[PDB]
Design a protein around this ligand. Structure first.
Ligand SMILES: COc1ccc2c(c1)N(C(=O)OC(C)C)[C@@H](CSC)C(=S)N2
Lengths: 430, 558
């Protein structure tokens, strides 16, 4: 019932050992969902039980991706990639098409079921050993190894890259303006077409995708108020900056102006050539804050000059491929957050406001987790790498609820914020 | 009595080799106790004499733990344990009694000397080589190997747990609803079949096993009900802990104190109402297990208050997968809170406490929520379910510290109840500055090598003041400076702050503290009708600046 294809040898980077991670215990509903998965797939020759001679480990979750009906498996191969793939980033790079961002709209498909067909290197497999949790630590965890290419791993599409190219070929030359990035289990597809044309130009790719190898794009169905019909289309041409809003009428009171200089004071390390004295002078005196004190003659200049450094910055925009982007977010109103992806402090690379409605489920953590992805597919689309996320949240609260609103494959790296920030004030970028 | 089961494959850590030693020459009396010993061990086929041809070796200990009749031996696979490959550790903790179920009848089988039967991989055995030399080096090479998983041996416990699992696999398949658990050397068999109808399966078990290479001397079903499980004390329908006798002295060292501190905690799964707080607060000066310490009156207060509950024994019920799982949290004060998890009202499932410590200046609502998790996290670690929450916090005060706080937060199915220490917001600040209210441009400072500072203010109506301070922090000080500022204001005030630090502290609205200073402010805040703060860049321009930091001048040059 089997047809042994052959393998591309995966080996251990800079003398390292394989990941020995710990499995976050989880829901029973979910501890069930994973046996109901792993066994039917153990049947399918994909996975296999191992003995004790194997100490390696790795996280397994359980999501319901497209909606609510059936579960999805997921793995935090984050230590294996952090292991192998910083050599299989070389030996097996998959290059980032920088016109990626340049395109009108980017859709993405789980063309990831597709690597189950590739056998994995027998001698390596030990490093894909995962485990499934038992309620209350009773029964010894249900332990499996990976026989094929794990849908999680970063070293997988590395390999299947080949077949990906070969399988796309006829498509690429039928439609050449379209580019495609094979990131993760992600087939990033963009075009300069109408929201109706790129939409079709896509299915065209889906069809092709069934035929030529019964590789498969999972059915697009869900209906959120932002009318998500068919297509998870990010529109990169929408990339304009409008965060740091100076209050229109706030140069009235001592207070307003007392705000106005502090804000101007953060900006000072961002646009260093900032001039704000003759404004500050307006408040050099111990005065009542509700005192409508108008501005000085020479002060308007400092507001005006600095008020035009905004519409045109320079040398920030410099990305370093030998360093790692960091995203950091912060909460604001009921559904408006903010992120700043820098790499070396204050040197902003990309910024934005994670919005959402006023009458909507104001669940912080829905926003935060859902905010996070929105960061990420863009950070892929643009740099093709994952930001260290500096998170406004309890370790243990996140380590307890992300797995709930995480309708995504890759699990970007993360950290959690100790001290509060002033930044939030009003839309501000660190 | 060697087993006939699929052994497990072990190599030593790549690169490393098996150990080679030569043991300390021993006499007549030590060797006799060992020859005799190895022979009938070899007899049970547990070991096999090999020849000169085996390179590696290790030593033997021919101990006598208590001074009882049967001599015994042991080998410290010290060096081997260094070498041998790594395993998937089985000691992944323990299951927690709370969350266990009520399985009518139950028995435990001692699988103690049930490893020696499990066979070693056929290739590693050479490594486990040991030599039995004589008194007069007449027979230098009396050496034996080791066919089964030896005592200690890194993998032993790792493997035996695995083998046994595959062993009860069909039985657990034929006799489904009975349920086996295993750890160390204790086998717990359980069902909901009447004693004799229960003893069947146990005996069946006692036999099935016997067919696989391993014996189980247990007898007529073996041991029942009074269970000393990993310390825990368990009964067919209830659990708790048993020997827990925290004493007292007239001169303790941190040494014994640690212990005292442990017990109290341990006893905290069950006994409603325990705290360790003060007994541990004092522990801080972490010197050696030789230094003694003055048990304070605050500590003994608790040392005694806690013994009362702990004086008279509390019981623990079992989990019932259908019944509601739930918990509500009471505050024990001093940032300490106590949670109780229950299904049937007043039926104690589990209890424990959350004490926000080793990191001062913390808000209450926040702490409420912090513990909720302690629970959420723990309720899954056991019931794999989320407790419905009975919590002492109004909705409108929540909806606010939900949407007030920065660090995003989340709380599942929570419901409101009454209880004296109700939590909520004592005060809040202002968003827009106050009309007509007085505007106080505060300031502080300190002698960066001379210990002193000056706190004070100047209002907009020309209201000045200062207060010379000593043995104070540039922080404490700029903090203290707001207290004055506070004090000398009527009802609705405006404060303009020099400092980030304190501005931040007063932004969060926490409460209690050993720092009477911070507290003293709290109360001011608490009493005021409308408090508005504002903040500005220190060295830069703190408004009236020139005058402000200038009237507080002493020693500075800038
Ligand atoms: C008085 O002893 C007990 C009372 C209740 C339970 C147990 C023992 N349990 C157990 O394995 O004991 C230790 C290892 C935790 C298991 C089934 S034991 C056949 C369960 S679900 N409830």
């Amino acid at each position: 019932p089997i047809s042994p294809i052959e393998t591309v040898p995966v080996k251990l980077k800079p003398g390292m050992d394989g990941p020995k991670v710990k499995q976050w215990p989880l829901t029973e509903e979910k501890i069930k969902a994973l046996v109901e998965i792993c066994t039917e797939m153990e049947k399918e020759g994909k996975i296999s039980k191992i003995g004790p001679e194997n100490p390696y480990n790795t996280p397994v979750f359980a999501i319901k991706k497209k909606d609510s009906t059936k579960w999805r498996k997921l793995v935090d191969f984050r230590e294996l990639n952090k292991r192998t793939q910083d050599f299989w980033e070389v030996q097996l790079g998959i290059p980032h098409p920088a016109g990626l961002k340049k395109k009108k709209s980017v859709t993405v498909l789980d063309v990831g079921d597709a690597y189950f067909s590739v056998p994995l290197d027998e001698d390596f497999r030990k490093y894909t050993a995962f485990t499934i949790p038992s309620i209350n630590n009773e029964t010894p965890g249900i332990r499996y190894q990976y026989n094929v290419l794990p849908q999680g791993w970063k070293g997988s599409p590395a390999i299947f890259q080949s077949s990906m190219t070969k399988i796309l070929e006829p498509f690429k030359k039928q439609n050449p303006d379209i580019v495609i990035y094979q990131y993760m289990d992600d087939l990033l597809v963009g075009s300069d077409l109408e929201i109706g044309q790129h939409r079709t130009k896509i299915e065209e790719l889906r069809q092709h995708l069934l035929r030529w190898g019964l590789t498969t794009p999972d059915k697009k169905h869900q209906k959120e108020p932002p009318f998500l019909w068919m297509g998870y289309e990010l529109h990169p041409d929408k990339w304009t900056v409008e965060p740091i809003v100076l209050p229109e009428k706030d140069s009235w009171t001592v207070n307003d102006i007392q705000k106005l200089v502090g804000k101007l004071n953060w900006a000072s390390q961002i646009y260093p050539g900032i001039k704000v004295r003759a404004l500050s002078k307006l408040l050099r005196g111990t005065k009542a804050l509700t005192e409508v004190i108008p501005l000085t003659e020479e002060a308007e200049l400092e507001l005006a000059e600095n008020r035009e450094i905004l519409k045109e910055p320079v040398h920030g925009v410099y990305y370093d491929p030998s360093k790692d982007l960091i995203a950091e977010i912060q909460k604001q109103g009921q559904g408006q957050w903010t992120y700043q992806i820098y790499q070396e402090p204050f040197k902003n690379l990309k910024t934005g406001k994670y919005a959402r409605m006023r009458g909507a489920h104001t669940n912080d953590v829905k926003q935060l987790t859902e905010a996070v992805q929105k960061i990420t597919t863009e950070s892929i689309v643009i740099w093709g790498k994952t930001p260290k996320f500096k998170l406004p949240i309890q370790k243990e609260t996140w380590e307890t609820w992300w797995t709930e609103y995480w309708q995504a494959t890759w699990i970007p790296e993360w950290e959690f914020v100790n001290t509060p920030p002033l930044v939030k004030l009003w839309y501000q970028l660190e | 009595p060697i087993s006939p089961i699929e052994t497990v494959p072990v190599k030593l850590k790549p690169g490393m080799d098996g150990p080679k030693v030569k043991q300390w020459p021993l006499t007549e009396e030590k060797i006799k106790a060992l020859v005799e010993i190895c022979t009938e061990m070899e007899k049970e086929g547990k070991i096999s004499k090999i020849g000169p041809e085996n390179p590696y070796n290790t030593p033997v200990f021919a101990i006598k733990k208590k001074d009882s009749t049967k001599w015994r031996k042991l080998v410290d696979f010290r060096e081997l344990n260094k070498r041998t490959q790594d395993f998937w550790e089985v000691q992944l903790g323990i299951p927690h009694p709370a969350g266990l179920k009520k399985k009518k009848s139950v028995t435990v089988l001692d699988v103690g000397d049930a490893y020696f039967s499990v066979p070693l991989d056929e290739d590693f055995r050479k490594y486990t080589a040991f030599t039995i030399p004589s008194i007069n080096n007449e027979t230098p090479g009396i050496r034996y190997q080791y066919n089964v998983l030896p005592q200690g041996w890194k993998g032993s416990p790792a493997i035996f747990q695995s083998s046994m699992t595959k062993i009860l696999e069909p039985f657990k398949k034929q006799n489904p609803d009975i349920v086996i658990y295993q750890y160390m050397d204790d086998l717990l068999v359980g069902s909901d079949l009447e004693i004799g109808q229960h003893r069947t399966k146990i005996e069946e078990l006692r036999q099935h096993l016997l067919r696989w290479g391993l014996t189980t001397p247990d007898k007529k079903h073996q041991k029942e009900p009074p269970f000393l499980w990993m310390g825990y004390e368990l009964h067919p329908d209830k659990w708790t802990v048993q020997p827990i006798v925290l004493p007292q002295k007239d001169s303790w060292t941190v040494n014994d104190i640690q212990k005292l501190v442990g017990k109290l905690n341990w006893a905290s799964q069950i006994y409603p109402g325990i705290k360790v707080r003060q007994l541990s607060k004092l522990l801080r000066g972490t010197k050696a297990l030789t230094e003694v310490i003055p048990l304070t009156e605050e500590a003994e207060l608790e040392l005694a208050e806690n013994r009362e509950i702990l004086k008279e024994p509390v019981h623990g019920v079992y989990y019932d997968p259908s019944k509601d799982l739930i918990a509500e949290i009471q505050k024990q004060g001093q940032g300490q809170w106590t949670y109780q998890i229950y299904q049937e009202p007043f039926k104690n499932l589990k209890t424990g406490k959350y004490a926000r410590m080793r990191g001062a200046h913390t808000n209450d609502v926040k702490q409420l929520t912090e513990a909720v998790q302690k629970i959420t996290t723990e309720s899954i670690v056991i019931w794999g379910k989320t407790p419905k929450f009975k919590l002492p916090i109004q909705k409108e005060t929540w909806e606010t510290w939900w949407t007030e706080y920065w660090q995003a937060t989340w709380i599942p199915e929570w419901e409101f109840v009454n209880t004296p220490p109700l939590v909520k917001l004592w005060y809040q600040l202002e968003k827009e500055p106050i009309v007509g209210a007085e505007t106080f441009y505060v300031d502080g400072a300190a002698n960066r090598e001379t210990k002193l500072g000056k706190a004070g203010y100047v209002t907009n109506k020309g209201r000045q003041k200062v207060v010379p301070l000593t043995n104070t922090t540039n922080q404490k000080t700029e903090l203290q400076a707001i207290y004055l500022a506070l004090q000398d204001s009527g009802l609705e005030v405006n404060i303009v702050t020099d400092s980030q630090y304190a501005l931040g502290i007063i932004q969060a609205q926490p409460d209690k503290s050993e720092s009477e200073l911070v507290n003293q402010i709290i109360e001011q805040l608490i009493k005021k009708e409308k408090v508005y703060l504002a903040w500005v860049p220190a060295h830069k321009g703190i408004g009236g600046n020139q005058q402000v930091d200038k009237l507080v001048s002493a020693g500075i040059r800038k």
